[PDB]
Homo-oligomer: A and B are copies of this chain.
Amino acid sequence: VRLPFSGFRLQKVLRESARDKIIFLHGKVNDAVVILEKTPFQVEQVAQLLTGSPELQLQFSNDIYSTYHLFPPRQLNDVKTTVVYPATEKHLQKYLRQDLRLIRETGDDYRNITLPHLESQSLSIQWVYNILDKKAEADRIVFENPDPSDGFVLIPDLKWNQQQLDDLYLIAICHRRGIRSLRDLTPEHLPLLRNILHQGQEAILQRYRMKGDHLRVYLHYLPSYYHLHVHFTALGFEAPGSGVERAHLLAEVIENLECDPRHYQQRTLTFALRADDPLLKLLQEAQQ
């Protein structure tokens, strides 16, 4: 009916979504958070104003094409205003999205900069180890090829509620300890990868009756943790990770290693890093 407080004072923009037409804003009042979402169109309201005389402003016109800047009446001007009053730092945390900067890492950049940095920051992958030795999430196992070397475990991702196929997000993990990232891959890793590709998709087609042509099979680089795991997502589903600056198709990771054996050891890989991430500056610096 109005405002919960008295006046807003914009401090920082928590999150942004230009694709989704939404804005997330933090503000001090009398702390609180305000969210604005541009409402999606209504078939009837739009068609009705179209057959009439609307306000149009020509941006440009080339060939059969032409764009306009439009201003519709009150009924089509709705915006979703979600207000969270009050809010704290444990809410600013999982609701703010940081700046992203792209970096191109040479064969040598990894060897001499990235890898020694990663060796410094003691990462715990005990949760993975526990999944592999069936100590944890044992029930969720969809498939397992228990070969110690060429073997893997196919489990559905934890955020997938498994109530629909549309958002199918499964994640395989190789049994062989030691493969940190996509950079540790040599032709000796080729059979373990082919099993994860074909054996995984077949486990999926048996358990979920989902054909290979409906599946995106990719690897992340730089990954969230350093122990080779492959993503298996439903094709129609678009979820941060399918982005060209991070995803590497298993189909091609295999075709590449088949052609150039030393490929992922020497070839320059592109990925983004958080502005706050210290590694980003270490590479920016090594490259000047």
Residues in A lying within 8 Å of B, measured CB to CB = 1-4, 7-10, 13, 16-23, 25, 27, 34, 36, 38-41, 43, 46-47, 50-51, 53-54, 56-72, 74, 76-87, 99-104, 124, 126-127, 130-131, 136-137, 139-140, 158, 161, 164, 166-167, 212-216, 218, 234-240, 242-245, 247-249, 251-252, 255, 259-260, 267-268, 270, 272, 284
Q: Given A18-B164, A71-B79, answer yes or no on A243-B244 (Cβ-Cβ < 8 Å).
A: yes
| In contact, B101 and A213 (Cβ under 8 angstroms) | yes
| In contact, B41 and A67 (Cβ under 8 angstroms) | no
CB distance from A51 to the nearest CB of B (A): 5
Show 10 residue pairs from A and B whose CB-CB distance is below 8 angstroms, ordered by the A residue: A2-B56, A21-B39, A25-B46, A36-B46, A63-B126, A67-B82, A104-B251, A238-B240, A245-B249, A251-B270
Q: A20 — which chain B residues lie within 8 A by C-beta?
A: 19-21, 40, 238
Q: Given A21-B38, A102-B213, list of 16 further CB < 8 A pairs? A: A2-B54, A7-B51, A16-B40, A16-B43, A18-B164, A21-B41, A60-B136, A60-B137, A63-B124, A66-B82, A66-B83, A66-B85, A67-B158, A71-B77, A252-B268, A259-B260
Q: Given A216-B245, A244-B244, answer yes or no on A74-B71 (Cβ-Cβ < 8 Å).
A: yes
* A21 partner, pick from B34, B40, B61, beta carbons under 8 A: B40
| CB-CB nearest in chain B for A213 | B101
| CB-CB nearest in chain B for A106 | B255
| In contact, B235 and A66 (Cβ under 8 angstroms) | no
| CB-CB nearest in chain B for A129 | B63
| In contact, A249 and B235 (Cβ under 8 angstroms) | no
* A137 partner, pick from B16, B18, B62, B137, beta carbons under 8 A: B62
Q: A47 — which chain B residues lie within 8 A by C-beta?
A: 8, 10, 25
* A101 partner, pick from B54, B235, B249, B272, beta carbons under 8 A: B235
| CB-CB nearest in chain B for A60 | B137
| In contact, A238 and B17 (Cβ under 8 angstroms) | yes
Q: A64 — which chain B residues lie within 8 A by C-beta?
A: 84-87, 127
Q: A235 — which chain B residues lie within 8 A by C-beta?
A: 100-102, 245, 272
CB distance from A56 to the nearest CB of B (A): 5
CB distance from A13 to the nearest CB of B (A): 6
CB distance from A37 to the nearest CB of B (A): 8
* A16 partner, pick from B41, B50, B127, B252, beta carbons under 8 A: B41
The 9 A-B pairs of least Cβ separation, nearest first, read: A62-B136, A18-B167, A244-B247, A19-B238, A63-B127, A38-B38, A68-B81, A101-B213, A70-B79
* A66 partner, pick from B4, B54, B71, beta carbons under 8 A: B4
